[PDB]
């Protein structure tokens, strides 16, 4: 005697796509319900599986010039400390050049880890100068203009001799926060005391005025790459982070 009774639980025929356990199909179109092996044939064996792949590749976030006209202690550039940052842009074709790190984290509600600001100098073996990079712990909105180069030394920072055989200084901003993770508030209409996206701001001071002869540029440009190590993101969401017009 057939006796296999099962009660119909709640959420009858309800659909959920928040995860794969419920998003996965319940049947297949494939004949005999077959499957597929792996195939790196024309893929050079470069099989991707993690977003880390992008969040670890230093991409160009911003460029700032260091003119000889800049005097000692003068703030050259200020940048918030959150992966969602990038200001690079090209006129035509019209496009807001987002960074790898950014384009990834932009799809998450939270993040944490050590952001890495790589600074590349484009001088000539004839210039000479130093720039102090200072990270002021806090939130993406803290008036910082009122900070002497001296005052800046209190916070963690690093100076760099531009004129040299080397060309890049790597600034690893340690995860410093009152919260375990920061949130992608760049989606919200306004800002709220507490709901922050960055753990502070980065500053580029003029340690030593840029010196040079006369048959060389009157300044030196600097590319600022951005990437992250020990990064962690969670809570999927959609949003194309716009440009942070500094």
């Amino acid at each position: 005697m057939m006796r296999n009774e099962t009660r119909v639980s709640t959420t009858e025929n309800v659909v959920n796509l928040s995860n794969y356990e419920d998003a996965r199909a319940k049947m297949s179109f494939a004949l005999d319900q077959e499957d597929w092996k792996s195939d790196p044939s024309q893929g050079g064996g470069i099989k991707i599986t993690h977003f880390t792949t992008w969040t670890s590749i230093p991409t160009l976030a911003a460029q700032f010039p260091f003119n000889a006209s800049d005097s000692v202690g003068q703030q050259i550039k200020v940048i918030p400390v959150d992966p969602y940052f990038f200001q690079m842009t090209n006129t035509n074709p019209d496009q807001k050049c987002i960074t790898a790190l950014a384009s990834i984290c932009q799809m998450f509600c939270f993040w944490r880890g050590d952001l890495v600001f790589d600074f590349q100098v484009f001088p000539t073996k004839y210039h000479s100068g130093r720039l102090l990079f200072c990270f002021v712990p806090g939130n993406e909105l803290i008036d910082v203009t009122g900070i002497t180069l001296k005052q800046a030394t209190t916070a963690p920072c690093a100076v760099m001799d531009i004129a040299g055989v080397q060309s890049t200084l790597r600034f690893r901003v340690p995860w410093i926060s009152d919260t375990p993770y920061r949130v992608n508030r760049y989606t919200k209409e306004a800002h709220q005391k507490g709901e922050y996206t960055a753990i502070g701001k980065l500053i580029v001071y003029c340690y030593n005025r840029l010196t040079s002869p006369s048959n060389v540029a009157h300044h030196v440009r600097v590319n600022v790459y951005l990437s992250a190590i020990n990064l962690e993101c969670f809570a999927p969401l959609y949003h194309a982070m716009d440009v942070t017009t500094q």
Binding site: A30, P40, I48, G113, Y225
Partner: protein, 225 residues
């Protein structure tokens, strides 16, 4: 601190683990799974497209194209768009899930049509022009709004190519940029009834692969319906 200074122009030196100030081990996360594992992430079937039937005994055929060119609604929107441009080559089945909205007691059918074969004109609602025989043959599925209201079936890796891609130009961007096509044909839909809407979402499978990382689409490219 040695990794605080290096020559990025040199491919080797650039891989030197960066380190500026003294830090301690971050520790352990409080949530089980890693939300950055593509498989687990896209595992969350994201939005693809949506359409609405107007007359009875008609059909809609939307293609699954990675083409960064094809702007939505007639193309990849939101997340799906963004994702399928982070890499150059894609291949593998895809767990599609379509939600039905509105009408009721409407009998329906749907079949997956591989790239390079006969199929009703894309992104257009019209009276099907295919032999019921032909339709079914490609493997189809029947259903009724009343009894269900949603369908989750897997889409096969049936293509004469090794892989497909979104970032392409004119020509190739018209052949090697498509997974395949889906076609939904309704039946018994006296418009004297409510409207009939369909929502399609795609989720990546474990049998899906991703090759070679590209530079993500610039914000201006990321569109949404």
């Amino acid at each position: 601190p040695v990794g605080a200074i290096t020559t990025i122009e040199d491919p080797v030196l650039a891989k030197k683990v960066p380190e500026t100030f003294p830090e301690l081990k971050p520790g352990e996360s409080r949530h089980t799974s890693d939300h950055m594992s593509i498989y687990k992430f896209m595992g969350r079937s994201h939005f693809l497209c949506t359409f609405t039937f107007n007359s009875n005994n008609k059909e809609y055929t939307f293609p699954i194209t990675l083409s960064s060119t094809s702007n939505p609604p007639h193309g990849l929107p939101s997340t799906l768009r963004w994702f399928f441009n982070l890499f150059q080559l894609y291949r593998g089945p895809l767990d599609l899930t379509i939600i039905i909205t509105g009408a009721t007691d409407v009998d329906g059918m749907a079949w997956f049509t591989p790239v390079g074969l006969a199929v009703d004109t894309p992104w257009v609602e019209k009276e099907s022009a295919l032999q019921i025989d032909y339709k079914t043959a490609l493997g189809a599925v029947r259903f009724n709004t009343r009894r269900t209201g949603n369908i989750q079936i897997r889409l096969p890796w049936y293509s004469y190519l090794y892989a497909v891609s979104g970032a392409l130009d004119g020509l190739g961007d018209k052949t090697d940029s498509t997974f395949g096509l889906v076609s939904i044909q309704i039946a018994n839909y006296n418009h004297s009834d409510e409207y009939l809407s369909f929502s399609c979402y795609l989720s990546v499978t474990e049998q899906s692969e991703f090759y070679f990382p590209r530079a993500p689409l610039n914000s201006n490219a990321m569109l949404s319906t």
